[PDB]
């Protein structure tokens, strides 16, 4: 039922750098994850232009932001193309080994952590704010999978028996205890307006009871 994998050494080092570096501008995680969602939504849109049946798993293309203060989670849900099991295991669809090389050279040559997305590895910015990240994904060509990692050099993959998603990717951020500002409506709104104001899909911020 649960498979445990080692990160490639370069990815483990990327994650360690994100977790251990003193860097105050953590809010950029949300821009990076919304960017990934937008890119996934563009991919299923483009495939649907020539094969409308690709949207049989859901026609609506959008992004939901779901804070839950009871669970201390921020969830980013998109209805994009989703990931196969293979692409989950292969660094969540990224060229993360080569991207990490380029990013670490850029940080040595004066870049900062906010530029992570320019190297194709923006997903890993989740670990600025999350102690654990859970990714639930569903691609038309595959079953629904759950990826998870608390860093420390490993991740797990299992077939997800949870709530069916139709198609797309859900990133569940289990926030660090000192990062609960990212569950507050006003703070999320501020970050979306500051860094994600030109994303071409609706971004709905859910509210809480
Ligand atoms: C397919 N795919 C996803 O399903 C996906 C991965 C991570 C994420 O936070 C959101 C996603 O939709 C995904 C993978 C990689 C990128 C990227 N921009 O490098 C974008 C999208
Ligand atoms: Cl690569």
From Swiss-Prot:
Residues bearing PTM N6-acetyllysine: 43, 69
Main localization, broad class: nucleus
Amino acids binding ATP: 36, 78, 97, 123
Segments forming a coiled coil: none
Keywords: Acetylation, ATP-binding, Cell membrane, Chaperone, Cytoplasm, Host-virus interaction, Hydrolase, Membrane, Mitochondrion, Nucleotide-binding, Nucleus, Phosphoprotein, S-nitrosylation, Stress response, Ubl conjugation
Post-translational modification (record): ISGylated. S-nitrosylated; negatively regulates the ATPase activity and the activation of eNOS by HSP90AA1.
GO terms of biological process kind: activation of innate immune response; cardiac muscle cell apoptotic process; cellular response to heat; cellular response to virus; chaperone-mediated autophagy; chaperone-mediated protein complex assembly; mitochondrial transport; neurofibrillary tangle assembly
Cell membrane among keywords: yes
Family: Belongs to the heat shock protein 90 family.
Function, in words: Molecular chaperone that promotes the maturation, structural maintenance and proper regulation of specific target proteins involved for instance in cell cycle control and signal transduction. Undergoes a functional cycle that is linked to its ATPase activity which is essential for its chaperone activity. This cycle probably induces conformational changes in the client proteins, thereby causing their activation. Interacts dynamically with various co-chaperones that modulate its substrate recognition, ATPase cycle and chaperone function.
Oligomeric form and interacting partners: Homodimer. Identified in NR3C1/GCR steroid receptor-chaperone complexes formed at least by NR3C1, HSP90AA1 and a variety of proteins containing TPR repeats such as FKBP4, FKBP5, PPID, PPP5C or STIP1. Forms a complex containing HSP90AA1, TSC1 and TSC2; TSC1 is required to recruit TCS2 to the complex. The closed form interacts (via the middle domain and TPR repeat-binding motif) with co-chaperone TSC1 (via C-terminus). Interacts with TOM34. Interacts with TERT; the interaction, together with PTGES3, is required for correct assembly and stabilization of the TERT holoenzyme complex. (Microbial infection) Interacts with herpes simplex virus 1 protein US11; this interaction inhibits TBK1-induced interferon production.
Listed name of the protein: Heat shock protein HSP 90-alpha
Species, as recorded: Homo sapiens (Human)
């Amino acid at each position: 039922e649960v498979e445990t994998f080692a990160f490639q050494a370069e990815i483990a080092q990327l994650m360690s750098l994100i977790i251990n570096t003193f860097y105050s501008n953590k809010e950029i995680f949300l821009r990076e994850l919304i960017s990934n969602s937008s890119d996934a939504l563009d991919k299923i849109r483009y495939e649907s232009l020539t094969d409308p049946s690709k949207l049989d798993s859901g026609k609506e293309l959008h992004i939901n932001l779901i804070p839950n203060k009871q669970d201390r989670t921020l969830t980013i849900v998109d209805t994009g193309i989703g990931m196969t099991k293979a692409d989950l295991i292969n660094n969540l669809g990224t060229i993360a080994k080569s991207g990490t090389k380029a990013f670490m050279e850029a940080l040595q040559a004066g870049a900062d952590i906010s530029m992570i997305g320019q190297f194709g590895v923006g997903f890993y910015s989740a670990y600025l704010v999350a102690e654990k990240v859970t990714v639930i994904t569903k691609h038309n060509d595959d079953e629904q999978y759950a990826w998870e990692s608390s860093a420390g050099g490993s991740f797990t993959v299992r077939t997800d028996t949870g709530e069916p998603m139709g198609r797309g990717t859900k990133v569940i951020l289990h926030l660090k205890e000192d990062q609960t500002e990212y569950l507050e409506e006003r703070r999320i709104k501020e970050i979306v307006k500051k860094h994600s104001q030109f994303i071409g899909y609706p971004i709905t911020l859910f509210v809480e009871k």
